[PDB]
């Protein structure tokens, strides 16, 4: 008797659901008066303060593998390039056929890395075919046919190519991501979370910390670090797994350079437009290369292998170089300055272990390409213009995207892989999730109104 309903508004409970999240970035590039492909497209202001707030006595489920807000991220990263490239002039007229030779570099009779390439092109808007010349990297060039030979670009037959507008910069910037009105974001302050299952310490925030859309395979660089020990995350259904993410607690320096000096040459296709071509080479010629501290890396491989063994307790672990296939997997990929570096990582992942510090620097040969299958997309490619002079680079390696082969007798063969671009960000957005508020609630109580 005398138990009687009451209703509350503003209630603190929640349920899981998908949402449309906000972009959130700096105002103008690195707060510098230049155009940036990410920041400049609105994305609201340089929100300085994350509203972190910690929860007493909250245990929370989390599924970073199935979390909805990686999909919207991938959709957003795709769309920004797609809309930004559109006004830039295309490469379609140049796709016509080529007749070219070995290039004579300065003070040199040969250069084994360079074709010098001659091509027909429309010089006025829509007439006056004429001959013109430039030079290209091999791996945008192919050839078979004719009574005498005949040359062609790698991708223009299968897919359309567009060169990025030259003033736009590729460099990544920290982007924050905020929930819209009526939803919130949870974190797992826990420093050893596996990625799935309940989370024993949870805090909430309107916006995530800055996340950097670094394009990379084979290595997580310019990223975050685990606060506790190294964390190894994998699919939980079976021993064999789709991908494994290792995330270091200490980050190792990588520097890279492209020493050859490059001067530019420009070809007018169009009206208020210009195809940007690569011209004469200058300077003592070397291939691009990167440098890593040796002894620190030896400790790094000992540490990650020390924890792989906890799962996998028998004697052997074997790391191996890339498996094979097309180049896009078998070299470590990134971009720096204004061009996209591809490096043969095989010398760096040749170790083997059994169970039971600014010297001796290792160097890796690293190759460079100008036409790209970006976002691993069907039927489309991008072209990158050359940058004047040499380039120097520094970045901080943070982790690996590795894969396991089909098992064999008392011997495991781990090599780089995973490959899917979504795993790049799934390695960093594992902490977060998005959730809806239901502010309404009902209860019994010892209370009424007056009928008068």
């Amino acid at each position, epitope marked *: 008797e005398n138990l009687w309903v009451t209703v509350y508004y503003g209630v603190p409970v929640w349920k899981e659901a998908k949402t449309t999240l906000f972009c959130a970035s700096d105002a103008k590039a690195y707060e510098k008066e230049v155009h940036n492909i990410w920041a400049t497209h609105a994305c609201v202001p340089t929100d300085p303060n994350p509203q972190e707030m910690v929860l007493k006595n909250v245990t929370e489920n989390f599924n970073m593998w199935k979390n909805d807000m990686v999909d919207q991220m991938h959709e957003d990263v795709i769309s920004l390039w797609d809309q930004s490239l559109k006004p830039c002039v295309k490469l379609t007229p140049l796709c016509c056929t080529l007749n070219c030779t070995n290039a004579t570099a300065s003070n040199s009779s040969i250069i084994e890395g360079m074709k010098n390439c001659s091509f027909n092109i429309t010089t006025e808007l829509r007439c006056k075919r004429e001959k013109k010349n430039a030079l290209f990297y*091999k*791996l*945008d*060039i*192919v050839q078979l046919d004719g009574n005498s030979s005949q040359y062609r670009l*790698i991708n223009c037959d*299968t897919s359309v190519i567009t060169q990025v507008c030259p003033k736009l910069s590729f460099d990544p910037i920290p982007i924050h991501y905020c929930a819209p009105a009526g939803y919130a974001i949870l974190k797992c302050n826990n420093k050893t979370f596996t990625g799935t299952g309940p989370c024993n310490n949870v805090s909430t925030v309107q916006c995530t910390h800055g996340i950097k859309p670094v394009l990379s395979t084979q290595l997580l660089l310019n990223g975050s670090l685990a606060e506790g020990e190294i964390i190894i995350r994998s699919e939980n259904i079976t021993k064999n797994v789709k991908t494994i993410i290792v995330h270091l607690n200490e980050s190792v320096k990588i520097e890279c350079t492209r020493p050859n000096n490059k001067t530019r040459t420009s070809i007018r296709i169009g009206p208020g437009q210009a195809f940007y071509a690569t011209g004469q080479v200058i300077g003592d010629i070397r291939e691009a290369y990167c440098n890593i501290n040796e002894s620190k890396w030896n400790e790094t491989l000992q540490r990650v292998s020390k924890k792989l063994k906890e799962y996998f307790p028998h004697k052997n672990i074997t790391f191996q170089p*890339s*498996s*094979g*296939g*097309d*180049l*896009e*997997i*078998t*070299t470590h990929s990134f971009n720096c300055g204004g061009e996209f570096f591809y490096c*043969n990582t095989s010398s760096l992942f040749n170790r083997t272990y059994m169970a039971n510090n600014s010297t001796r620097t290792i160097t890796i*040969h690293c*190759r460079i390409k100008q036409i790209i*299958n970006m976002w*691993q*997309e*069907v*039927g489309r490619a991008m072209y990158a213009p050359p940058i004047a002079g040499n380039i120097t680079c520094i970045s901080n390696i943070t982790g690996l995207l590795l*894969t396991r*082969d*089909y098992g064999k007798n008392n011997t495991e063969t781990f090599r780089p*892989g995973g*490959g899917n671009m979504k795993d790049n960000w799934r390695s960093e957005l594992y902490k977060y999730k998005v959730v809806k508020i239901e502010p309404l609630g009902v209860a019994p109580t010892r209370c009424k109104r007056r009928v008068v």
Partner: nanobody
Amino acid sequence: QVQLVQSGAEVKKPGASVKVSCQASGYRFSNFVIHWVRQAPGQRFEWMGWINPYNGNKEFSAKFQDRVTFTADTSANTAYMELRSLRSADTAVYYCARVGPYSWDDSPQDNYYMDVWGKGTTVIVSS
């Protein structure tokens, strides 16, 4: 070791379709392009096309583009092919293939030579 294993032999009706599968082992299936090749009795091998499981881009011989279709699945370690509108000339032994690994010195598409094959499958067009 490396092996590619195929479906059973087929005898199918004229005018209908024939569909074949090719399951692999010994290597990560998602990191190698896959070919399809046919040989009639006593004749040359004829190119059909290629597929790259990593992306699903496709390229066909224009002789067969209206007749053939490929697809691949990373969770199955298997590639599929489908040839529509069978005729008596299609009676042949069909193969799937794998290419060699790219190396640093290679130009593009130096490696699409046939590195490994399967045991093949017999297809006969008959009522």
